[PDB]
């Protein structure tokens, strides 16, 4: 029930601790075009946090060359915070250093 609840609501953390639970992690998959579905599946989110208060994360940084699409960000109050992977970008899955 906890996994089902967390993926159903997108609130992450304990259900009783929804006050401190990061929200919107899990979203309903977008089905308007194939491109919309693909872009939703390859989406990255920048939480606001305390870090957002320190350095301006909205503006496009040079290190996003080849990793993140430079010209795909949602307009409005989420500009530059929600991003999309570049086509050949691939996220390391992690292995053991031993």
């Amino acid at each position: 029930d906890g996994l089902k609840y967390s993926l159903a609501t997108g609130n992450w953390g304990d259900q009783k601790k929804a006050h401190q639970a990061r929200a919107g992690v899990s979203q309903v998959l977008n089905r308007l075009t194939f491109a919309s579905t693909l872009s939703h599946l390859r989406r990255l989110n920048s939480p606001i946090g305390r870090d957002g208060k320190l350095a301006k994360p909205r503006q496009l940084h040079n290190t996003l060359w080849g990793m993140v699409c430079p010209a795909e960000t949602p307009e409005g109050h989420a500009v530059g915070l929600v991003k999309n992977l570049a086509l050949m970008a691939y996220i390391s899955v992690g292995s053991q250093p031993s």
Binding site: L7, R22, S26, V28, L29, L41, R43, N45, S46, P47
Partner: protein
Amino acid sequence: FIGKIPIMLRSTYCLLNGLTDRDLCELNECPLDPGGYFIINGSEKVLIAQEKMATNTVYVFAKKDSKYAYTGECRSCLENSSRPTSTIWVSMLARGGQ
């Protein structure tokens, strides 16, 4: 038995793993559907990737809004255990102190 884990579609434990296009059409599943999402109560839910600061790395900033000239933090985190990550600041006091 201890619970039920949701399965991301077309992952290596989904029943659609490694099936031909004819088989996917036999199951009324689009062969171009990339998967990569869960089904929770029939609703197709996608987990958005969340960016955060990398761990176990020394980062030296200069807090413009404090009595510290510089602060060297390190969000130290164990090797895939104890998700509470202990962050430690090592800060040089500003010379304009009392």
